[PDB]
């Protein structure tokens, strides 16, 4: 299938309390596989998925040095940024970075990603062409002019089209069923009397991977979108996800309601009922 | 500077059964900035050794964390998640309900 | 694997 690799970096300044805290995490699709935290006792890239543990000590050692250098670079960026925005040197600011590659079933690069946000707002993004930038404002234009003059996009293309795609392809091979085969949800309906005239029907989807899923209630085959309470998809803490959809129904009318489940792991879309 | 209020869900990893070991989760998402305080409470008291996921963020740059602890649900014991954030004027307490 | 990139904003 189609797959993604993404690195997510968060730098948070704390002027007076030392260098900004740098945290990195790496994902393949919805699976986290690495982390680094500048505030750990011995900062190093650590595994967070079983299938990366096989990578040798030079993998871990290279990546650790890259994160330590990136923490220093981000520290410099935050200084430049408070300067560009004419902000106080006393306050805490956030720099987030998100980069990686989307690849199709053939494992060819579909799209490259390389963007930044300052204080939770879009700042600069590499465009789909991977050769030009979109700056959000005049501050971001300073970064843009510098990175154009330095041919930064050209330097970054190499990683997105090369190492990003080849290491993703590697991780996908080594993850095997964990990354390439969808885990279908375990589904059930529960019934929660509110009074003698109303009851809640709750349709559960548990232990599924990846996160993408659709849950809907239907009354006599008609979608009940207006009257469905749908919780945001949430992590189980074991690399799988959960979701539920609930509808309030008149007592004795339960038989009119069906829950409909769409997920990549199911042989076909499921219809469930109170049973 | 963007501020986004955290969304909170409190739930078990598996469907709760009294006297069966489980995981109590507090999922805090959609917040900015990243500075946040999350405590799991048992009968109003802070649970110790509570762990959390590595700080991550969504396509809109909003942060999410899972706070979790091992627990054995019983009939009587009450669990909750207490969240403090710059966007909240009071700490937000969400009670665990095993049907949610 | 993460990229090596030393460019500041």
């Amino acid at each position: 299938g189609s797959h993604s690799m993404r690195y997510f970096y968060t730098s948070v300044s704390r002027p007076g309390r030392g260098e900004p805290r740098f945290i990195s995490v790496g994902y393949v699709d919805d699976t986290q596989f690495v982390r680094f935290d500048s505030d750990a006792a011995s900062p190093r890239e650590e595994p967070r998925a079983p299938w990366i543990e096989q990578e040798g000590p030079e993998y871990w050692d290279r990546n650790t040095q890259i994160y330590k250098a990136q923490a220093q670079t981000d520290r410099e960026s935050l200084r430049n940024l408070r300067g560009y925005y004419n902000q106080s040197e006393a306050g805490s600011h956030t720099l987030q970075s998100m980069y990686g590659c989307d690849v199709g079933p053939d494992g060819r690069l579909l799209r490259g990603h390389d963007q930044y946000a300052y204080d939770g707002k879009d700042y600069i993004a590499l465009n789909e062409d991977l050769r030009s930038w979109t700056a959000a404002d005049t501050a971001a234009q300073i970064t843009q002019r510098k990175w154009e003059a330095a041919r930064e996009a050209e330097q970054r293309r190499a990683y997105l089209e090369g190492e990003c795609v080849e290491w993703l392809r590697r991780y996908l091979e080594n993850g095997k069923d964990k990354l390439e085969r969808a885990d279908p949800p375990k589904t059930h309906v529960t019934h929660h009397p509110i009074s003698d005239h109303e009851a809640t029907l709750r349709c559960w989807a548990l232990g599924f991977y990846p996160a993408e899923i659709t849950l809907t209630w239907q009354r006599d085959g008609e979608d009940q979108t207006q009257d469905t309470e749908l919780v945001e998809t949430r992590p189980a803490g074991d690399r799988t996800f959960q979701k539920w959809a609930a509808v309030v129904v008149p007592s004795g009318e339960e038989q009119r309601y069906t829950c409909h489940v769409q997920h990549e792991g199911l042989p076909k879309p499921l219809t469930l009922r109170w049973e | 500077m963007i501020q986004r209020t955290p969304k909170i869900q409190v739930y078990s990893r598996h469907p709760a059964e009294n006297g069966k070991s489980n995981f109590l989760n507090c999922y805090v998402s959609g917040f900015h900035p990243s500075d946040i305080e999350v405590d799991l409470l048992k009968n109003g008291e802070r649970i110790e050794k509570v762990e959390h996921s590595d700080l991550s963020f969504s396509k809109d740059w909003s942060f999410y964390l899972l706070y979790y602890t091992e627990f054995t649900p019983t009939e009587k014991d009450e669990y909750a998640c207490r969240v403090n954030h710059v966007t909240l004027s009071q700490p937000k307490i969400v009670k665990w309900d095993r049907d949610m | 694997i993460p990229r090596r990139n030393v460019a500041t904003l």
Side-chain angles (χ1 to χ4, degrees), chain A residues 8-10 12 23 25 27 32 35 48 92-94 96-98 115-117 119-122 192 202 204 206 231-238 242 244, chain B residues 1-2 4 7 9-15 23 25 27 29 32-35 52-58 60-64 66 68 98-100:
Chain A
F8 305 88
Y9 299 170
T10 306
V12 180
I23 291 166
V25 298
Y27 281 80
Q32 197 205 327
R35 66 140 178 244
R48 304 295 274 154
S92 177
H93 298 273
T94 310
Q96 289 159 277
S97 316
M98 178 162 54
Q115 63 189 130
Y116 297 84
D119 288 330
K121 195 187 167 85
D122 288 290
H192 313 280
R202 180 169 293 107
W204 298 82
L206 296 175
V231 294
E232 288 198 343
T233 302
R234 64 199 193 186
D238 63 6
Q242 308 185 345
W244 60 248
Chain B
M1 198 130 21
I2 300 310
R4 300 169 178 274
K7 296 159 184 204
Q9 298 193 61
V10 188
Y11 56 99
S12 58
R13 175 173 304 173
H14 309 291
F23 283 83
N25 288 338
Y27 183 57
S29 61
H32 221 290
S34 58
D35 227 283
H52 63 82
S53 60
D54 307 313
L55 188 63
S56 316
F57 53 86
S58 306
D60 68 357
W61 307 103
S62 72
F63 292 108
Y64 63 88
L66 185 66
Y68 60 90
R98 69 182 63 207
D99 297 336
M100 288 180 155

Side-chain angles (χ1 to χ4, degrees), chain A residues 37 56 65 122 128 134 139 153 163 170 179 189 199 257-258 261 272:
Chain A
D37 174 5
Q65 295 312 303
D122 288 290
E128 271 195 294
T134 301
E163 283 174 351
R170 182 188 170 110
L179 295 175
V189 170
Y257 292 80
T258 54
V261 188
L272 290 99

Side-chain angles (χ1 to χ4, degrees), chain A residues 172-175 177-180 182-227:
Chain A
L172 279 175
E173 218 296 298
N174 305 341
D177 277 358
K178 281 318 190 191
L179 295 175
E180 216 109 36
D183 235 87
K186 294 172 264 83
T187 56
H188 74 285
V189 170
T190 59
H191 184 267
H192 313 280
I194 291 173
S195 73
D196 288 332
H197 308 280
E198 289 179 335
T200 297
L201 289 172
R202 180 169 293 107
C203 184
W204 298 82
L206 296 175
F208 59 88
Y209 184 88
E212 174 61 24
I213 193 165
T214 308
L215 289 187
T216 56
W217 275 107
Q218 284 184 201
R219 184 195 188 272
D220 297 349
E222 312 270 332
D223 200 277
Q224 300 298 285
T225 11
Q226 304 180 244
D227 304 306

Side-chain angles (χ1 to χ4, degrees), chain B residues 23-48 50-58 60-73:
Chain B
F23 283 83
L24 179 66
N25 288 338
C26 185
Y27 183 57
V28 295
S29 61
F31 63 96
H32 221 290
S34 58
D35 227 283
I36 197 161
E37 186 180 299
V38 185
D39 287 310
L40 298 180
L41 309 181
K42 172 177 189 190
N43 304 317
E45 303 290 336
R46 185 185 172 276
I47 301 168
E48 303 171 54
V50 169
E51 296 175 280
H52 63 82
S53 60
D54 307 313
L55 188 63
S56 316
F57 53 86
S58 306
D60 68 357
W61 307 103
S62 72
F63 292 108
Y64 63 88
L65 290 169
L66 185 66
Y67 283 79
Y68 60 90
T69 196
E70 202 145 52
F71 85 137
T72 303

